[PDB]
Specification:
Number of strands: 7
Strand content: 15-25%
Shape: globular
Name: Non-structural protein 3
Largest sheet: 4 strands, mixed
Helix content: 25-40%
CATH superfamily: Leucine Aminopeptidase, subunit E, domain 1
PDB class: viral protein
Number of helices: 6
Order of helices and strands: EEHEHHEEHEHEH
Strand order of the largest sheet: 1-2-7-6
Bound molecules: the ligand C[C@@H]1[C@@H](C(=O)O)CCCN1S(=O)(=O)c1c[nH]c2ncc(Cl)cc12
Entry title: PanDDA analysis group deposition -- Crystal structure of SARS-CoV-2 NSP3 macrodomain in complex with REAL300016493575 - (R,S) isomer
Structural class: alpha/beta
Keywords: Macrodomain, ADP-ribose, SARS-CoV-2, viral protein
CATH topology: Leucine Aminopeptidase, subunit E, domain 1
CATH class: Alpha Beta
Assembly: monomeric
CATH architecture: 3-Layer(aba) Sandwich
Length: 167
């Protein structure tokens, strides 16, 4: 038993809710919240900009030190940093950005990072401003992640379309 509430169960291990991931993180304080990161950990907009804003820019300060030490992430890669006031940890995961021409096949590699964590609160990778089809992202999620994932979808219209078209 965990504290996630109001989710629709899609599979044995994947759950979905129309929710603002920032507000959901603030309420649940999950062990892991996933950020929709880029390789530079520049949290300017989308999910990343919202999570960072909610940390009063502490996520960005920590991220800048991480990059100065380690260099950029790989597309499809991840790093674990603090969850600040939102979660114990933040798993920064880089899905491919279609608006940069990145290979969509890397979306599966991106989701594989979730398997290193027993339970996660997450957005749909490569959705939103990353330009991928969210229905496809959900399919890759279900077919790749084996750990327990609670997906927060900000847009109610998109949430209803994801549920209604889910196979
Ligand atoms: C897939 C989501 C989708 C959702 O999950 O409802 C709705 C719009 C597109 N994006 S987005 O790229 O991540 C995004 C852009 N700005 C944002 N600000 C805050 C938050 Cl929480 C998410 C975003």
């Amino acid at each position: 038993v965990n504290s996630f509430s109001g989710y629709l169960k899609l599979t044995d291990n994947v759950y979905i809710k129309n929710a603002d991931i920032v507000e959901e993180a603030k309420k649940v304080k999950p062990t892991v919240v996933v950020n929709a990161a880029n390789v530079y950990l520049k949290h300017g907009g989308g999910v990343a900009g919202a999570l960072n804003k909610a940390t009063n820019n502490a996520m960005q300060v920590e991220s800048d030190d991480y990059i100065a030490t380690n260099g950029p992430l790989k597309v499809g890669g991840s790093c674990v940093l603090s969850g600040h006031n939102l979660a114990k940890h933040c798993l920064h995961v880089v899905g491919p950005n279609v608006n940069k021409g990145e290979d969509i096949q890397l979306l599966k590699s991106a989701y594989e990072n979730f398997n290193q964590h027993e339970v996660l609160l997450a957005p749909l990778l490569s959705a939103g401003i990353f330009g991928a089809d969210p229905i496809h992202s959900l399919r890759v999620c279900v077919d790749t992640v084996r750990t327990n994932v609670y997906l927060a979808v900000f847009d109610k219209n998109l949430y209803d379309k994801l549920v209604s078209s889910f196979l």
